[PDB]
Design a protein around this nucleic acid. Sequence first.
DNA 1: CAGCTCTGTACGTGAGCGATGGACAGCT
DNA 2: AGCTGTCCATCGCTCAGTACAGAGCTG
Length: 196
Amino acid sequence: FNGVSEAELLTKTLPDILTFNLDIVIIGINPGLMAAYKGHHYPGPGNHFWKCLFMSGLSEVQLNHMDDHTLPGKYGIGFTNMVERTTPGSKDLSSKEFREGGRILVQKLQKYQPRIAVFNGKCIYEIFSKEVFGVKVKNLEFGLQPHKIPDTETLCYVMPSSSARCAQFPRAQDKVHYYIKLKDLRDQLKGIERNM
DNA sequence: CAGCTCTGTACGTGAGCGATGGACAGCT
DNA sequence: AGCTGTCCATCGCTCAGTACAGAGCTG
């Protein structure tokens, strides 16, 4: 990576971008190498996140990973990951690392209490659900889940990973439906709060 | 049996690498 | 004209979770 070794990148981490009073926290899996290199969320040339964010109207202009620190204040959106350690991929992580992450994540969510905890990936919600809700359904679906983060009113919302690795949702366009329904959920919640 | 859970196989786009070679201008 | 190197268009290529079948487990 412009002369930086993988071995160097494996030891970097990616800072969370979290505040109080967020509408949404995007929870990725763990930093990939490019994220680790950049120190910003979803820089992957092919990752669909920033494209989907704009295509859905969650951002009114096309943003990119360099804009990530502006999202809390301007857009009501923050970032963390289920697991902190950088790896060359999401099947390099152990079940223990995942469960440790889940525990850490739920404490972060109990602290910051966003309106909506967004799992950027079905696989990490599968883990979270088992660990936190003691529930594994056989037919986990995308979208809104039926359990709030414990001791909070923060909902859980699941999307197909923005990584372009998965073939079932081959393009940004194939995932945008979930970002639109995420926008609608936020808008609904704000509307309830506004109208009491 | 019937539900699990656990493991390994199989899958579509598009961005951007290095390699290649065509267009072209400088120089003789 | 003949030679040569640069630029750049273009290529083939790689590669950034999910669904599901089947084996194993257990009630």
